[PDB]
Amino acid sequence: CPLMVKILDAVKGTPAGSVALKVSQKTADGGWTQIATGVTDATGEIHNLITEQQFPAGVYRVEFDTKAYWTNQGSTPFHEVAEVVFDAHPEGHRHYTLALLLSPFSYTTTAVVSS
Amino acid sequence: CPLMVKILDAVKGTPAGSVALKVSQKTADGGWTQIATGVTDATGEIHNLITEQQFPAGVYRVEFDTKAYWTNQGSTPFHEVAEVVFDAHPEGHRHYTLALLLSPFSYTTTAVVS
Amino acid sequence: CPLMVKILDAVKGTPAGSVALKVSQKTADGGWTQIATGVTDATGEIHNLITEQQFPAGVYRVEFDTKAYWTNQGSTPFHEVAEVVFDAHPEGHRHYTLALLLSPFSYTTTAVVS
Amino acid sequence: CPLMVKILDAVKGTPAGSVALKVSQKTADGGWTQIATGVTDATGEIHNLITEQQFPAGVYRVEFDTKAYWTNQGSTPFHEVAEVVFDAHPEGHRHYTLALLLSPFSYTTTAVVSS
Numbered sequence: 379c380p381l382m383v384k385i386l387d388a389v390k391g392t393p394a395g396s397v398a399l400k401v402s403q404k405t406a407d408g409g410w411t412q413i414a415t416g417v418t419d420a421t422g423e424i425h426n427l428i429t430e431q432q433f434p435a436g437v438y439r440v441e442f443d444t445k446a447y448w449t450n451q452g453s454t455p456f457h458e459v460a461e462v463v464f465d466a467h468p469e470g471h472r473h474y475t476l477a478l479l480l481s482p483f484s485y486t487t488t489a490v491v492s493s
Numbered sequence: 494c495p496l497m498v499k500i501l502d503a504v505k506g507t508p509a510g511s512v513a514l515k516v517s518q519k520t521a522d523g524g525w526t527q528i529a530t531g532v533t534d535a536t537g538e539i540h541n542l543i544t545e546q547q548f549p550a551g552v553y554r555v556e557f558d559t560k561a562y563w564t565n566q567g568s569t570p571f572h573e574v575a576e577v578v579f580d581a582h583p584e585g586h587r588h589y590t591l592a593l594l595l596s597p598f599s600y601t602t603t604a605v606v607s
Numbered sequence: 608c609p610l611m612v613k614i615l616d617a618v619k620g621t622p623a624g625s626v627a628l629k630v631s632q633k634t635a636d637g638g639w640t641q642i643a644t645g646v647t648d649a650t651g652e653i654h655n656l657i658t659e660q661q662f663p664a665g666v667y668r669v670e671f672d673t674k675a676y677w678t679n680q681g682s683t684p685f686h687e688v689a690e691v692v693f694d695a696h697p698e699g700h701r702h703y704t705l706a707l708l709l710s711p712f713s714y715t716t717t718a719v720v721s
Numbered sequence: 722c723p724l725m726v727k728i729l730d731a732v733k734g735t736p737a738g739s740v741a742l743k744v745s746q747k748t749a750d751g752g753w754t755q756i757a758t759g760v761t762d763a764t765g766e767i768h769n770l771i772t773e774q775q776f777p778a779g780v781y782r783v784e785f786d787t788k789a790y791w792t793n794q795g796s797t798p799f800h801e802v803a804e805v806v807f808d809a810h811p812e813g814h815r816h817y818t819l820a821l822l823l824s825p826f827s828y829t830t831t832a833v834v835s836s
């Protein structure tokens with residue numbers, strides 16, 4: 379699997395479980411095609427989110443529904459979502475991990491890309 | 494002015510100057526209408542980005558052109574753009590500052606709401 | 608003034624007021640001498656923390672009492688303290704701002720150096 | 722093993738390999754006893770850093786030598802070190818992961834604590 383996530387909760391000090399997300403692929407006219415969805419497990423991950431065949435070179439957007447996560451925790455969130463948008467170059471089985479650290483009014487996102 | 498930004502560069506330890514951005518408001522059908530553009534000054538800020546009259550409650554997106562920023566700094570970036578999407582509640586002259594801390598492969602974003 | 612701070616609270620979206628801190632400079636033998644203390648105001652800042660005369664080059668530590676801050680906010684914290692340790696190069700009236708973004712189990716810290 | 726680290730490099734998008742660190746335990750008179758040292762592997766980790774017997778309840782400091790890491794990468798760093806100081810409550814095999822995200826002038830650190 380070429381696309382992984384890892385979400386952490388900076389209030390409780392745990393992975394962020396049960397965060398819904400969507401993966402989309404940019405189209406030529408500037409639109410977006412939804413290619414996968416899921417909800418993180420208790421480790422803040424979604425295993426086998428997409429296949430290599432689903433992940434050709436191009437621009438991808440991963441939208442994480444952080445607002446619902448905070449509402450369920452009892453916190454008042456600032457952001458509607460956290461968006462991560464990047465150009466993927468999957469040749470040679472290059473892998474992408476999108477790391478995300480959540481607080482009610484803030485997030486940090488980084489990427490780990492293999493070679 | 495109800496919407497401010499403060500952008501810092503985590504590599505060189507300065508504000509991030511000359512970062513282009515676009516502000517959009519979400520429509521009832523789920524699309525986006527662009528309402529303003531700007532470019533940060535050497536303090537990482539943009540003065541008078543929009544007016545209160547342009548800022549009813551609703552969902553807004555600020556799209557920061559971080560890819561161009563990092564290319565111009567000479568460092569290969571990861572993100573195509575940095576988007577900050579938030580629901581505004583301006584009643585009571587509430588003001589919003591979007592703070593943004595940039596690295597080539599990472600950013601942190603937070604808000605200060607008065 | 609050559610040393611400033613800016614502390615934000617990532618839970619409530621405000622500056623972090625009433626955060627206590629202590630500034631120390633490292634001695635030649637590797638110990639620490641405390642040179643100043645302060646407490647942030649409601650903007651998350653401390654004005655006139657030290658003077659240029661108190662700020663030769665060297666290694667400095669700022670110790671922020673984040674555990675007390677979070678206990679007072681009513682949220683269990685992880686860290687006992689947040690320490691920022693850096694080598695200062697004041698020649699040329701160079702000024703340092705320590706930016707700090709706090710959550711109960713996490714912090715981000717960066718610097719703006721003029 | 723009750724104490725793990727995970728260090729990432731926010732410039733290159735990789736784990737931060739070959740970062741030296743030290744683990745110390747606070748003493749009653751306010752001093753520090755060094756209990757372990759190591760250097761991260763290419764995954765940004767140190768496996769089996771300490772044992773459970775080495776990790777009684779108390780205050781611990783993990784000092785990461787980030788300055789040398791950036792000098793080797795060719796960057797000019799701000800911080801001398803990154804310090805993480807916390808009170809450990811290891812009963813019930815509670816585990817601590819210290820996550821650290823590095824840039825030349827900035828770091829983010831969070832903890833993942835099990836239960």
Ligand SMILES: Cc1c(Cl)cccc1Nc1ncccc1C(=O)O
Binds near residue numbers: 501593594707708715
């Ligand atoms: C403290 C900070 C961080 Cl941690 C990251 C990005 C900008 C900032 N700074 C600010 N954010 C909001 C308003 C003012 C500032 C400032 O630095 O003056």
Ligand SMILES: Cc1c(Cl)cccc1Nc1ncccc1C(=O)O
Binds near residue numbers: 478728729821
């Ligand atoms: C270190 C870290 C930070 Cl600083 C923020 C969010 C997730 C992580 N953790 C990871 N990121 C990527 C891959 C693995 C991990 C992990 O913690 O196992």
